[PDB]
Amino acid sequence: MPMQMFMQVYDEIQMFLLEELELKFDMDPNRVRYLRKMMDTTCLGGKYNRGLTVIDVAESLLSDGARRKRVLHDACVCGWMIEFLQAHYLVEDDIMDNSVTRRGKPCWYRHPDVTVQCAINDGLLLKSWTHMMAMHFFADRPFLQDLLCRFNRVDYTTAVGQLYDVTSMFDSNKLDPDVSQPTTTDFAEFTLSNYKRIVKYKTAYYTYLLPLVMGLIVSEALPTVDMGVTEELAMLMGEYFQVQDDVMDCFTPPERLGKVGTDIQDAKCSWLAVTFLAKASSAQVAEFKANYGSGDSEKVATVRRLYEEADLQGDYVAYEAAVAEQVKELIEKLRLCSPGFAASVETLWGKTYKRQK
């Protein structure tokens, strides 16, 4: 059922937005139809991990079934708010990362009828919809200001995180708008510390912390949990989710992965790249340097090979276990004063640990 009503409120939101376009922006049915397709293709098809979480927290915490209905609905709107924020990111990320496929279909900007320019602006419309939906449905909620501050910080922090990711293959000392510069040939920026920073901000926040917080907000229970504990947790699960994407991006088939991995070509600061570079010998490192950051498929075939070659899967299992115990400890601190919350945090974790997704 959670999914049942989630989809129902999707329909609501779609109706209100599209109809509002119709009436108040002088929109013809064609463009209106365009945007319905855009919205279904970018927003739907996922597993709604972040959205559902928000409901799940709300329902755990709500502990006159009108209050039940109000929280549940709000939670669903918040859920879609996060899902549309994510859709906005992916539309724009795929463009920035020059990706081919997402979710099993082609990236939005790679549809035959969607120009790159229009995709950038469709990206922006998606972000704007989060605000429009929030303002409509929470217009007379006491928490609306706090929700919109929080949400905007996250989205800002996500963009800062993007700045890190997108500038990780340039030696940060040569960073200047006025003077051009090429892919780093010593990679001395590739470092776990740098990697951790990029992920914290580009992923952790809008993926793990924001769904938890929104669910608490609609529940009027945010002060009841230990935030410090919650923040540590979100950061941890978030980092471990990005690393999992980094490994899959190299070693899970695009068919099961519903995308094709561009980390090796984009010369990305992926987990496999940093972990290799801190453990590998000199000949391994010199091959790598000569075989990373090039679309060539013999050179791409080399790096992938070279990872397998130096036993990264092993490092990933140790990491995973290190994380998994650290999560278990933290959740138990959290159960002490907030059992209901800790339950739904566990569930979320349960959806992440050793995902094949």
Ligand X SMILES: CCCCCCCCCn1cc[n+](CC(O)(P(=O)(O)O)P(=O)(O)O)c1
Told to check if 262 binds a copy of itself by CB under 8 A, we report no
Per DSSP, helices labelled H in the chain are: 2-24, 29-43, 49-61, 66-97, 116-137, 144-166, 192-199, 210-219, 227-251, 254-257, 271-279, 282-291, 297-309, 312-337, 339-350
Amino acid type, 54: V
Q: Which is nearer to ligand X, 56 or 266 (CB)?
A: 266
Task: Tell me the DSSP string of 218-252.
Answer: HHT-GGGS-HHHHHHHHHHHHHHHHHHHHHHHHHS
Q: Which region among 20-28, 89-97, 140-148, 319-327 touches ligand X (by CB under 6 A)?
A: 89-97
Amino acid type, 2: P
Told to check if 249 binds Mg ion by CB under 5 A, we report yes
Q: Which region among 25-33, 236-244, 311-319, 338-346 touches a copy of itself (by CB under 8 A)?
A: 25-33
Out of 83, 155, 189, 239, the only residue in the binding site for ligand X (CB under 6 A) is 155
Q: Which region among 50-58, 94-102, 271-279, 280-288 touches a copy of itself (by CB under 8 A)?
A: 94-102
Told to check if 147 binds a copy of itself by CB under 8 A, we report no
Q: Binding to a copy of itself (CB under 8 A): which residues in 168-187?
A: 172-173, 175-181
Do the beta carbons of residue 133 and residue 77 sit within 8 Å?
A: yes
Q: How far is the CB of 197 from a copy of itself (least distance, A)?
A: 5
Reference 342, options 207, 221, 240; nearest CA is: 221
Q: Which region among 21-29, 157-165, 169-177, 277-285 touches ligand X (by CB under 6 A)?
A: 157-165
Distance CA 231, CA 222 (A): 13
Q: How far is the CB of 340 from ligand X (least distance, A)?
A: 29
Q: What are phi and psi of 102, to 5 degrees?
A: -145, 140
Q: Which two tokens stand for residue 180?
A: 């051009």
> What would you report as the CA-atom Rg of the chain, rounded to the nearest whole angstrom?
21
Residue 118: CB atoms within 10 A of its CB come to 15
Q: How many residues bind a copy of itself (CB under 8 A)?
A: 63
Q: How far is the CB of 249 from ligand X (least distance, A)?
A: 6
Name the burial class of residue 289, with classes exposed (0-12), middle (13-18) and buried (19+) by CB atoms within 10 angstroms of its CB: middle
Give residue 103's region: left, alpha or beta (phi > 0; psi -120 to 50). Answer: left
Out of 121, 183, 185, 224, the only residue in the binding site for a copy of itself (CB under 8 A) is 121
Told to check if 124 binds ligand X by CB under 6 A, we report yes
**Residue 93 known to bind ligand:** yes
Told to check if 121 binds ligand X by CB under 6 A, we report yes
Amino acid type, 95: I
Distance CA 336, CA 226 (A): 10
Told to check if 145 binds ligand X by CB under 6 A, we report no
Told to check if 59 binds ligand X by CB under 6 A, we report no
Binding annotation for Mg(2+): 93-94, 97, 165, 245, 249, 263
Binding annotation: 93-94, 97, 165, 245, 249, 263
Residues at the contact surface with ligand X, assessed by CB under 6 A: 89-90, 92-93, 97, 99, 121, 124, 155, 158-159, 162, 202-203, 245, 249, 259
Residues at the contact surface with a copy of itself, assessed by CB under 8 A: 21, 25-28, 30-31, 33-35, 37-38, 41, 92, 95-97, 108, 111-115, 117-118, 120-122, 124-125, 128-129, 131-132, 135, 144-145, 148-149, 152-153, 155-157, 159-160, 162-164, 166-167, 172-173, 175-181, 197, 200-201
